[PDB]
């Protein structure tokens, strides 16, 4: 392999990894008493609703979990729990829950590809074939010098009509959702029950259109806005390395960046409940006093410094501003 596919020292090898088994088998929550609940997600035929199916069978494990010297997470079988029960080792933590906001998505601005063209073609054909039909069989214009052919009309009609039809037809979409009424959600304790927001909720949110995504697939563009507006939890924890858990890549640590890990929240009404989500950020710090340990973010969390939340909005703007220039 090294003689057939030579690679230089320093070559940056790119890969994509599936650390969220959501569409095959994983867990979204469980209990310290009885274990994690194995489940699957599927998108139903509208593209927006996700069904959760719960496995009734006894848990199985990937073959690496028998091998001598292995450590690490596969999303089929997450194992890590950060307990905030008595004798916890975590220095500090913040657990955040954000509710789902929006209940239907509005898209658009421009008509779908070909809709404006098909109308303009019809106006060109109608005006140019009408004076062709009139000049060929029916009539002429009596001018001072004799007869005159009526001009082709299709270009001037198309001109005067353009403000009245351009981006009128197939130019917007509304996509609905079951959020108000009831869904099962990939949150610990919401996987088997059905809960909705309630009769009182925020109604509409605009799907951003600067890269024209709705003209490739309006459902996919609304999937991205559904994801941005989902019910979510996150847990930020500060912890010292290698007891209980080693932090390191698969084969060397119990979990790494992107892996599904569980945790419990100190004052929570049901003390044994494990919330499961993926590690989104890891920070390590060392000083002349030794390690400060790891900052772990579990689930997706906004920058705590509000100035960094200002920079995050400005990055999204400069990307949208670039495509509006194209």
């Amino acid at each position: 392999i090294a003689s057939l596919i030579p690679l230089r020292h320093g070559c940056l090898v790119w890969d994509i990894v599936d650390n969220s088994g959501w569409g095959s088998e994983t867990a979204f929550g469980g209990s310290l008493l009885t274990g994690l609940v194995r489940a699957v997600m599927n998108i139903a035929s509208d593209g927006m609703t996700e069904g959760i199916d719960i496995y009734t069978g006894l848990p199985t494990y990937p073959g690496e979990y028998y091998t001598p010297g292995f450590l690490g997470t596969y999303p089929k079988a997450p194992h890590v729990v950060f307990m905030e029960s008595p004798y916890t080792g975590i220095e500090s933590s913040k657990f955040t829950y954000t509710e789902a906001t929006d209940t239907s998505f509005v898209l658009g601005g421009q008509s779908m590809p070909g809709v404006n063209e098909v109308i303009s073609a019809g106006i060109n054909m109608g005006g140019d074939f009408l004076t062709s039909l009139i000049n060929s069989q029916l009539a002429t214009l009596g001018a001072f010098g004799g007869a005159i052919d009526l001009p082709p009309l299709g270009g001037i009609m198309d001109a005067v009509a353009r403000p009245l039809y351009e981006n009128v037809v197939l130019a917007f979409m509304e996509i609905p959702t079951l959020r108000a009424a009831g869904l099962s959600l990939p949150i610990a304790g919401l996987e088997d029950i059905v809960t909705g927001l309630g009769d009182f909720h925020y109604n509409e949110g605009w799907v951003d259109g600067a890269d024209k995504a709705f003209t490739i697939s309006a459902i996919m563009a609304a999937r991205a806005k559904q994801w941005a507006t989902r019910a979510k939890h996150s847990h930020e924890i500060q912890v010292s390395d290698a007891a209980p858990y080693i932090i390191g890549e698969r084969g060397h640590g119990h979990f790494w960046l992107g892996d599904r890990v569980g945790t419990t929240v100190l004052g929570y009404p049901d003390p044994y409940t494990i919330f499961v989500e993926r590690v989104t950020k890891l920070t390590y710090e060392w000083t002349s006093d030794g390690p400060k340990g790891w900052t772990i973010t579990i689930g997706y969390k906004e920058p705590e410094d509000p100035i960094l939340k200002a920079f995050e909005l400005i990055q999204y703007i400069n990307s949208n501003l670039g495509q509006l220039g194209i």
Partner: peptide, 22 residues
């Protein structure tokens, strides 16, 4: 003290590089 605001300013400047470039 001015130094504590200056230290936290320097950390935010190093994390802003996630979101901006020349």
């Amino acid at each position: 003290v001015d130094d504590a605001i200056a230290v936290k300013n320097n950390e935010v400047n190093k994390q802003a590089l996630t979101y901006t470039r020349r």
